Every structure is written in C-alpha cells, then in structure tokens.
mmCIF file of C-alpha atoms in Angstrom:
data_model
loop_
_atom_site.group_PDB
_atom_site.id
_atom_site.type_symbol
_atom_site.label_atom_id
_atom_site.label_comp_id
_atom_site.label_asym_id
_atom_site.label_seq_id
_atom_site.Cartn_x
_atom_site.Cartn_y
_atom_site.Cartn_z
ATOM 1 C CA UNK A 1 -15.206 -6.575 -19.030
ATOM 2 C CA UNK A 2 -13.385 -4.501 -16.076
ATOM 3 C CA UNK A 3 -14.248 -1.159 -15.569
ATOM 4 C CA UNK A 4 -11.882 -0.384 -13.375
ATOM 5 C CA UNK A 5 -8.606 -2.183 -15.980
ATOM 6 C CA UNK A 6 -6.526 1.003 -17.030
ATOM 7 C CA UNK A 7 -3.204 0.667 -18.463
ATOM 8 C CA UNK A 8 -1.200 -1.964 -20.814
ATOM 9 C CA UNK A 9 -0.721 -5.450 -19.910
ATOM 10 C CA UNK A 10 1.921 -5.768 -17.417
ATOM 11 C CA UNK A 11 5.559 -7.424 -17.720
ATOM 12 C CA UNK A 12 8.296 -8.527 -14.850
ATOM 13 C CA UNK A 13 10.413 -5.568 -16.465
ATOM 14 C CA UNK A 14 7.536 -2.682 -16.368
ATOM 15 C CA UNK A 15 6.360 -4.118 -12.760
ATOM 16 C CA UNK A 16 10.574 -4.049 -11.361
ATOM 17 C CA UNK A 17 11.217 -0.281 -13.590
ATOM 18 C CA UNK A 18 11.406 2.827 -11.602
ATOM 19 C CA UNK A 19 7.864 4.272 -12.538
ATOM 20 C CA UNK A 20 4.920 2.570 -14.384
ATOM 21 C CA UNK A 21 3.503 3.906 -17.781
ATOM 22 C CA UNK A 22 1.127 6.883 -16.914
ATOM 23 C CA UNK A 23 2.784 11.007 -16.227
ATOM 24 C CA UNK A 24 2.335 11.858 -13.259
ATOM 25 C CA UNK A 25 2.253 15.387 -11.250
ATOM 26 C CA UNK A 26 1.731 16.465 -7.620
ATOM 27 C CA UNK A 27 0.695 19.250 -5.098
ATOM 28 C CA UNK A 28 0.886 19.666 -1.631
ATOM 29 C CA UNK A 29 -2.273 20.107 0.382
ATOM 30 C CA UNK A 30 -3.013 23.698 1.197
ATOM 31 C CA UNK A 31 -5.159 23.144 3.985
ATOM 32 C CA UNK A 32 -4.451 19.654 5.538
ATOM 33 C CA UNK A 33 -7.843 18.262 7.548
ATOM 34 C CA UNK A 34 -7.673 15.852 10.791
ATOM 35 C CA UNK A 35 -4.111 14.963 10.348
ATOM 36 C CA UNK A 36 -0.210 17.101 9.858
ATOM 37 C CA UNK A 37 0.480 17.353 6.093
ATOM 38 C CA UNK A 38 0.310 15.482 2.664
ATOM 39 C CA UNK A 39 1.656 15.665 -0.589
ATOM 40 C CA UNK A 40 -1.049 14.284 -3.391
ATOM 41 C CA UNK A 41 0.708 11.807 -6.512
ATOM 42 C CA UNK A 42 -1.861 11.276 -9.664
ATOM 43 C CA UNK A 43 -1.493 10.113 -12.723
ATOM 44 C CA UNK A 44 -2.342 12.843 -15.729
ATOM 45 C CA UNK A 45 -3.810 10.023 -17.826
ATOM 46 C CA UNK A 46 -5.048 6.806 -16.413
ATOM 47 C CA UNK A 47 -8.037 6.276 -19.365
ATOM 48 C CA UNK A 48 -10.206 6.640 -16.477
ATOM 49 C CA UNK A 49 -11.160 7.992 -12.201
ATOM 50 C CA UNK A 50 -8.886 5.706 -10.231
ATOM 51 C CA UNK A 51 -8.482 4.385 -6.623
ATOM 52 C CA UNK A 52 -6.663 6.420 -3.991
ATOM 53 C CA UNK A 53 -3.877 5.251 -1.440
ATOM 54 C CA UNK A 54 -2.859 7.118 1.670
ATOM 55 C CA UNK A 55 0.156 6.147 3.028
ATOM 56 C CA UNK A 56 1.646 6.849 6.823
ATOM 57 C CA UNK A 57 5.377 7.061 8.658
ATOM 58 C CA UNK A 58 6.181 5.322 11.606
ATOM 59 C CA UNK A 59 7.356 7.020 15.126
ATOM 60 C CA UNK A 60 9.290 10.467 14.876
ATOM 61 C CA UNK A 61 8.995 9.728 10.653
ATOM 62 C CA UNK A 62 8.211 12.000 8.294
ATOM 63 C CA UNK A 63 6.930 11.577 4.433
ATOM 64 C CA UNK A 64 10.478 11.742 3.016
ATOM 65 C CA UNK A 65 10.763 7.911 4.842
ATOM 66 C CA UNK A 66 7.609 6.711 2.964
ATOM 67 C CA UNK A 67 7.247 8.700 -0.281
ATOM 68 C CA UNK A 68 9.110 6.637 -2.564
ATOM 69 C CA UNK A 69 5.678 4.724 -3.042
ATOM 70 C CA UNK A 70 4.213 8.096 -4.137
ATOM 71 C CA UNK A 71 5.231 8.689 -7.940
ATOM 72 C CA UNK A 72 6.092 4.358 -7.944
ATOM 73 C CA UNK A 73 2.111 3.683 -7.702
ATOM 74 C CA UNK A 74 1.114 7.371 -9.077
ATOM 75 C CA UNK A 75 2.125 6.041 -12.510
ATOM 76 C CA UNK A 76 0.646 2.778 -12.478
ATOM 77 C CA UNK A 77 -2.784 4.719 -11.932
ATOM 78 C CA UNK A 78 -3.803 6.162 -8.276
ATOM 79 C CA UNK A 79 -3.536 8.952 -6.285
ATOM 80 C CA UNK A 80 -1.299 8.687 -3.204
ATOM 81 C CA UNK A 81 -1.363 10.860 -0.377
ATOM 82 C CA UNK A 82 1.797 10.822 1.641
ATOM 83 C CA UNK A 83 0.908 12.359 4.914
ATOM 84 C CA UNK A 84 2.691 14.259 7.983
ATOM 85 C CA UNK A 85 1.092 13.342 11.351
ATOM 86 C CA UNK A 86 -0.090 15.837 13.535
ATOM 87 C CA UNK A 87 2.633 15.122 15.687
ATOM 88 C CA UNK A 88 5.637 13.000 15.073
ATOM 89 C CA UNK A 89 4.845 10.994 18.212
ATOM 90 C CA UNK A 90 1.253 9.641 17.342
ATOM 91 C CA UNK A 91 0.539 6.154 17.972
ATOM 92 C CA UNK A 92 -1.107 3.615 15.812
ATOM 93 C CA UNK A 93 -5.106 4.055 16.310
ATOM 94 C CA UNK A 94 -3.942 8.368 15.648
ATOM 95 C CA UNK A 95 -2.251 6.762 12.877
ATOM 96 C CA UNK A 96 -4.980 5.157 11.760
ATOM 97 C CA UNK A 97 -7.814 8.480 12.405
ATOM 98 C CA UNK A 98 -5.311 10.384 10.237
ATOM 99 C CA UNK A 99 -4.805 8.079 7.187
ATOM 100 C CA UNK A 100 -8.731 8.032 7.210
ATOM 101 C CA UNK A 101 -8.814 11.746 7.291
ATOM 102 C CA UNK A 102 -6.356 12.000 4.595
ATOM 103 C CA UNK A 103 -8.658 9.453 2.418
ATOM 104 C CA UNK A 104 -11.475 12.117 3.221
ATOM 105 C CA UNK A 105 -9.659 14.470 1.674
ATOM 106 C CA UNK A 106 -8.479 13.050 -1.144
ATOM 107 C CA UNK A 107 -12.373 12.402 -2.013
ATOM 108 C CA UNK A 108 -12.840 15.844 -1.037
ATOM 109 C CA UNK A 109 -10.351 17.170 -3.536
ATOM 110 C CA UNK A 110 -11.650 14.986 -6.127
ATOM 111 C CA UNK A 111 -15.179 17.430 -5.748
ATOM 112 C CA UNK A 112 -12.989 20.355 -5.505
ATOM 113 C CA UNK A 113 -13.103 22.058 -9.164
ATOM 114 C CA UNK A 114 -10.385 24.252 -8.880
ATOM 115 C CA UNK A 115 -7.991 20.886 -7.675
ATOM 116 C CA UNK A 116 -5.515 19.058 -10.084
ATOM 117 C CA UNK A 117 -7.467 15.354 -8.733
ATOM 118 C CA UNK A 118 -10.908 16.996 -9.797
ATOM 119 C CA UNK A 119 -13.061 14.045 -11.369
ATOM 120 C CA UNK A 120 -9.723 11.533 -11.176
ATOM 121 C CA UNK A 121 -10.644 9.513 -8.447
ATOM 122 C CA UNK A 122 -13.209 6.722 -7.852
ATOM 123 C CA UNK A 123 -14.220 7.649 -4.585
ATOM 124 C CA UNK A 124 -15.309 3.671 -3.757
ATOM 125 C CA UNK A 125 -11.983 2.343 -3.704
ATOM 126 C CA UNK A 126 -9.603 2.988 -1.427
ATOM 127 C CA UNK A 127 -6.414 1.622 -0.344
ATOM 128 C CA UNK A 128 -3.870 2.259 3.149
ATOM 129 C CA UNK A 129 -0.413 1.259 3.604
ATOM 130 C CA UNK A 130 2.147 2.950 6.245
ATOM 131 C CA UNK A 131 5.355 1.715 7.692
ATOM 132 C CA UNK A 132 5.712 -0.140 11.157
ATOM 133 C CA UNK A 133 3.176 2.202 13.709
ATOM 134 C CA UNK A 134 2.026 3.754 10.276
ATOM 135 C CA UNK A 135 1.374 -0.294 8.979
ATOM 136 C CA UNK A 136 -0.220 -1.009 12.546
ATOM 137 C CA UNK A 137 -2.277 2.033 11.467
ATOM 138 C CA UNK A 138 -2.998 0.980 8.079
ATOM 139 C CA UNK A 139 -4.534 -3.083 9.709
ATOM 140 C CA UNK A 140 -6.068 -0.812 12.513
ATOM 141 C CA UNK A 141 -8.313 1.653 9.720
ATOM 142 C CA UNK A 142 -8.728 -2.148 7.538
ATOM 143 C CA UNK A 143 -10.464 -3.457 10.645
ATOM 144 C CA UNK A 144 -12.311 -0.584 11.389
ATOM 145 C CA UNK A 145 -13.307 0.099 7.558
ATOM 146 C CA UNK A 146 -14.092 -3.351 5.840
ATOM 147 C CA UNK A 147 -15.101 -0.982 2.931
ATOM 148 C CA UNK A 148 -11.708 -0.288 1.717
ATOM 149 C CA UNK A 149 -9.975 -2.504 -0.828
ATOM 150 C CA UNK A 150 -6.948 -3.133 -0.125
ATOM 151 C CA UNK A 151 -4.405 -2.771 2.576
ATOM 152 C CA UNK A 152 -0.209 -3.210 2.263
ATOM 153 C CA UNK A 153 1.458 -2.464 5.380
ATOM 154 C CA UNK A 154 5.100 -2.536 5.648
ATOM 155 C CA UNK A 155 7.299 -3.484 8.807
ATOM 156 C CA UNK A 156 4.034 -3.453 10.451
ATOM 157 C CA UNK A 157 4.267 -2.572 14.721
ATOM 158 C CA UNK A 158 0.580 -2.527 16.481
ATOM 159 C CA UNK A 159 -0.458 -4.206 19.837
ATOM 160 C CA UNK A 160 -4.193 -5.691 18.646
ATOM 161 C CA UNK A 161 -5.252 -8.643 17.117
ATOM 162 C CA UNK A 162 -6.546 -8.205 13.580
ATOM 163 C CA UNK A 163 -8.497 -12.052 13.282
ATOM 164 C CA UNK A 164 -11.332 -9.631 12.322
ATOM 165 C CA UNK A 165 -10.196 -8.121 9.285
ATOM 166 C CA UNK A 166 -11.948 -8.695 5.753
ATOM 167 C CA UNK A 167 -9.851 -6.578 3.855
ATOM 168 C CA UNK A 168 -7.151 -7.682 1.543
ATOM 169 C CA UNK A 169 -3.876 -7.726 3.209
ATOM 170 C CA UNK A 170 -0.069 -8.092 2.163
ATOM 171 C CA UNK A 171 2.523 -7.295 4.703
ATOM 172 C CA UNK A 172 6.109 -6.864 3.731
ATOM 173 C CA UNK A 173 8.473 -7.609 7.008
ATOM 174 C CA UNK A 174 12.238 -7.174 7.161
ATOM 175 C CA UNK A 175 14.110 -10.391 8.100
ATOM 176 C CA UNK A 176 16.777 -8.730 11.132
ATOM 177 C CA UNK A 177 14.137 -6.019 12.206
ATOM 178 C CA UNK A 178 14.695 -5.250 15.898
ATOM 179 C CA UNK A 179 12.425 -2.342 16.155
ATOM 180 C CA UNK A 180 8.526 -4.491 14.794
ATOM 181 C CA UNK A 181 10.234 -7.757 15.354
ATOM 182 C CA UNK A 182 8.280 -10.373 12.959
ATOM 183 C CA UNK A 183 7.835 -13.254 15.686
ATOM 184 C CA UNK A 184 5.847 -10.501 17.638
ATOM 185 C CA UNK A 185 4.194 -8.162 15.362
ATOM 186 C CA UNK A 186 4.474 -9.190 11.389
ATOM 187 C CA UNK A 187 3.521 -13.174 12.364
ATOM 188 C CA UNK A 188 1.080 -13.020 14.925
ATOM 189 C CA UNK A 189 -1.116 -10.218 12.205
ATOM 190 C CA UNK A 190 -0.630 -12.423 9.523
ATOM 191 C CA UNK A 191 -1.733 -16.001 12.051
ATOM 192 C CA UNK A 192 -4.408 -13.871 13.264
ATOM 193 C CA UNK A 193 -6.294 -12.914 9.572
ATOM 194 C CA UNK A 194 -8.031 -15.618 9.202
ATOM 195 C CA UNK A 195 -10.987 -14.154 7.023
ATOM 196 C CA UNK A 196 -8.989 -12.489 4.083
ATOM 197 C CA UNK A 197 -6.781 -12.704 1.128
ATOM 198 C CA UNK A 198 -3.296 -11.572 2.487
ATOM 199 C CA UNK A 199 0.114 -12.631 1.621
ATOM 200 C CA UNK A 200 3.524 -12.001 3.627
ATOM 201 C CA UNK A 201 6.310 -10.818 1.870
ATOM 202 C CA UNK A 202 10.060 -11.696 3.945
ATOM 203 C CA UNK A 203 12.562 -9.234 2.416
ATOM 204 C CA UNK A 204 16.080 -11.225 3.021
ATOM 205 C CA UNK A 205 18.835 -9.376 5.284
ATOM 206 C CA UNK A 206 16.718 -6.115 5.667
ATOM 207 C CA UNK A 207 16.532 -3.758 8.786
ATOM 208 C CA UNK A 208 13.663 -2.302 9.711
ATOM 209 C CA UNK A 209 13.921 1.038 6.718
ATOM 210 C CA UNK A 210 14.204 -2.241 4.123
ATOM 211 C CA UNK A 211 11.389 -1.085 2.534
ATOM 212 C CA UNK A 212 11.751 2.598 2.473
ATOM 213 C CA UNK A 213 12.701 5.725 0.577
ATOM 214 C CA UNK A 214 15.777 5.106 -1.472
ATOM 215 C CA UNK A 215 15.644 1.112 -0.463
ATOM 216 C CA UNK A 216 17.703 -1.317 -2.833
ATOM 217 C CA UNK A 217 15.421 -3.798 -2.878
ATOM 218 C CA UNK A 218 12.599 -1.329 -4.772
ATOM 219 C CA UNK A 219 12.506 -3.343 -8.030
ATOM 220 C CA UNK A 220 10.811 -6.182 -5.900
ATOM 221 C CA UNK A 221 8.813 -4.512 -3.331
ATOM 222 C CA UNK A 222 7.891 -2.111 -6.080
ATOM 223 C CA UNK A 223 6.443 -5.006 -7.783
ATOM 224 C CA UNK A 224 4.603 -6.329 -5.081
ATOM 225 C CA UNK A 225 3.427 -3.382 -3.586
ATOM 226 C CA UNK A 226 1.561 -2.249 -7.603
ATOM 227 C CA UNK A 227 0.602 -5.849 -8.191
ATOM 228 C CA UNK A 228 -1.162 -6.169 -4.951
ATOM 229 C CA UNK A 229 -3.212 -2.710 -5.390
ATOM 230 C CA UNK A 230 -4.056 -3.162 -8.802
ATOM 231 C CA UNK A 231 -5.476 -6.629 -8.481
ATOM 232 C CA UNK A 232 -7.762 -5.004 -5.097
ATOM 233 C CA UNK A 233 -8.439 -1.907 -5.651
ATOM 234 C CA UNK A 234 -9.418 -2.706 -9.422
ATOM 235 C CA UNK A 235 -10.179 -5.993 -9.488
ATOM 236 C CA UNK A 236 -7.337 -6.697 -12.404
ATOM 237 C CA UNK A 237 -6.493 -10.281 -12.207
ATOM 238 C CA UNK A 238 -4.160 -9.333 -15.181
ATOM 239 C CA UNK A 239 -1.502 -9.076 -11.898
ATOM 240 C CA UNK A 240 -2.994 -12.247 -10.410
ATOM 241 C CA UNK A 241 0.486 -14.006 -11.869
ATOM 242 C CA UNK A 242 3.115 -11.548 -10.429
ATOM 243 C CA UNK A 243 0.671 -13.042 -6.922
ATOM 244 C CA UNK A 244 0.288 -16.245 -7.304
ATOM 245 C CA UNK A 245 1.332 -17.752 -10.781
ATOM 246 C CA UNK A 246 4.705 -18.524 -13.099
ATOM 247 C CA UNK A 247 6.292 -15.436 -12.469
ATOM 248 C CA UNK A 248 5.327 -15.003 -8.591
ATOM 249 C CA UNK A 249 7.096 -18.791 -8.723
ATOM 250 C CA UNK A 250 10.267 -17.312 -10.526
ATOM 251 C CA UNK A 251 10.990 -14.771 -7.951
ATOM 252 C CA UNK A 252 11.109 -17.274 -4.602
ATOM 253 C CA UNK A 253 14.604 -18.330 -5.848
ATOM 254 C CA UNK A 254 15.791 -15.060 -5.167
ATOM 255 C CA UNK A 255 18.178 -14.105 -2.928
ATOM 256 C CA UNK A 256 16.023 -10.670 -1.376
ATOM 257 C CA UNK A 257 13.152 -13.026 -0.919
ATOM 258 C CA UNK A 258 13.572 -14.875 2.808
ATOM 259 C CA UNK A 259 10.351 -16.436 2.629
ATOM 260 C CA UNK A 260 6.672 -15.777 1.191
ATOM 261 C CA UNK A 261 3.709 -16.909 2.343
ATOM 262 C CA UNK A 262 -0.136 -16.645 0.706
ATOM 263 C CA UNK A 263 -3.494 -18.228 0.762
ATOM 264 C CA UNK A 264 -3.621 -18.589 -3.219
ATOM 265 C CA UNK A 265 -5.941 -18.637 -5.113
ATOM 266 C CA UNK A 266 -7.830 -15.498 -5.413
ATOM 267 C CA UNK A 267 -10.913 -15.780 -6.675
ATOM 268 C CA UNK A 268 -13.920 -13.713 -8.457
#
C-alpha cells in the first residue's frame, strides 16, 4: 500500500480538465533566496505532505510564460514554485542553481510555522521542469541531483550531454521550433539518457511557446505533464496507463501528437 497515493482514481476526462480535484491557494515569496522571485501553488487538501515542483522560464521569460503548470499540478497534489530569475538573461547551469534554490525554499517554508505550506510537503521528493534554457536547467539540476524524482522539461535548449542522468525524464518538444530546434537539442538529450525512464512527447505544428501559458494544446500536455509527476514523485502506477497502456495507445492517433517515444515498461 502507497504512502505517497493521494487523490481519486484518475480518468482521460479529469487528467485533460482544467484543474485536478484538490482547492488550491497561493502566495508569493516574501523574501526570495538564491534566485529573482516565485509564486508558491498547494493544494489545501491532498489527504497527506506532498512532493514539490519548481518550475523555470527560458531567456528574457518571466513566470507569466510558465505558470499555467502552477494551479494545473497544484490541484492534482504538489506545491509548485514558479520562479523569476535573478536576471532575465541567466543561462542554463544559473537556471539550474536557481530552481535548486527555489526547491530549498520550498522545504524551508514547509518548516516555517507561520507559512501556508507548513507541514504540506514531503521534503524527499522533488520534481523540476522549466521551458527551453529553463528545461536545459531542469536536465542540468537532474544530473547534478540524482536524488530528485522526477524531471519534465519542455522545449528543452542546453549545450551538455545528459548520458549521465538517473532521474526520470519526459521532454515535451514542439514540432516547427526554430529557437531549441529538436534535431539539436530535444533528440540528442533524449539519445543521450541512456540510464533512465524518460519518454518524448512531439506536440504536432507547435512553435516553440506550444507548451506555454494559455497554450491550446493544455488538455494533452496537461495530461502528460500530471501523469508523469504523479507516477515519480509518488510512485502511483495508478497513471502508469495514461504512460504506457490503453489509453496512452488511444491518444497517438491524434492529430496534436507528431510522434512519442518511451522505454516502456516502468517497473517497481
């Protein structure tokens, strides 16, 4: 029996729907540490602490770009932590230091009596995910920190090789992206991870923004995006199907799929 299971068993419609089935507040971090700003997303009644997800903008973004995922995964049961960077023109391994710093706060917080997160958060499991530098950022802090859970990049741009990384790994890439083209960044990261559960989600027709703030394609990255974290960051194999069953299956005949690609099964 999983510890770590919170919330009813999931359907294609509750997975695609705007929010999940927990209430959900935020608060924006008084006193931000090692990195710009951050708003903080957590559900008011998970049935238990939950994991915690930080999530980082690309070049000369901000957390309007990114945000979207806040109150989306907030309500299927974690606290997300959209951040600023210090500056708007940080690279990837910044990227990366900051995200981490943000986690440290959000554990921080979660000892902090007089904060909303106090006691909400298990402080073991810990998630990243950031768009293009922000995503290079997220696979840099997964390499670095074999520790966390779970890592979902989006549009992913980063100039290492990542063959090292143990960590989970999904990466949704945008078909006609010009600015992290997939033959040079998205590919090569997913080629390279050769010691990990990972998948590759193609979103059909989409620019590089395909997967952010106010995208139309949010029922299935959405569904992706909270299948993926709840099945590594608690272990919930309840979501293994949206991953890699009858349902996963369903979705490859549509149209806003391209192409996906996994190393199925994932096993306990």
């Amino acid at each position: 029996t999983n510890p770590y299971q919170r919330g009813p068993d999931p359907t294609v419609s509750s997975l695609e729907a705007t929010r999940g089935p927990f209430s959900t507040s935020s608060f924006t971090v008084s006193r931000p540490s090692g990195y710009g700003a951050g708003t903080v997303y957590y559900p008011t009644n998970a049935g238990g602490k939950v994991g915690a997800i930080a999530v980082v903008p690309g070049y000369t973004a901000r957390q309007s770009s990114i945000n979207w995922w806040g109150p989306r995964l907030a309500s299927h049961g974690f606290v997300v932590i959209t951040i600023d960077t210090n500056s708007t023109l940080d690279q990837p391994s910044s990227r990366s230091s900051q995200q981490m710093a943000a986690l440290r706060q959000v554990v921080s917080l979660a000892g902090t009596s007089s904060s909303p997160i106090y006691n909400k958060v298990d402080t073991a499991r810990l998630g990243v995910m950031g768009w293009s530098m922000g995503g290079g950022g997220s696979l840099i802090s997964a390499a670095n920190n074999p520790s966390l859970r779970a890592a979902a990049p989006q549009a992913p741009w980063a100039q290492e090789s990542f063959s090292s990384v143990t960590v989970p790994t999904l990466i949704v890439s945008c078909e006609n992206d010009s600015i992290a083209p997939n033959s040079s960044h998205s590919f090569p990261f997913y080629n390279q991870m050769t010691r990990n559960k990972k998948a590759n989600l193609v979103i059909n027709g989409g620019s590089h923004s395909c997967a952010n703030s106010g995208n139309s394609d949010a029922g299935l990255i959405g569904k992706y995006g909270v299948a993926w974290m709840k099945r590594f960051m608690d272990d919930d194999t309840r979501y293994s199907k949206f991953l890699c069953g009858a349902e996963h299956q369903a979705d490859l005949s549509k149209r806003a799929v391209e192409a996906y690609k996994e190393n199925c099964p994932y096993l306990e």
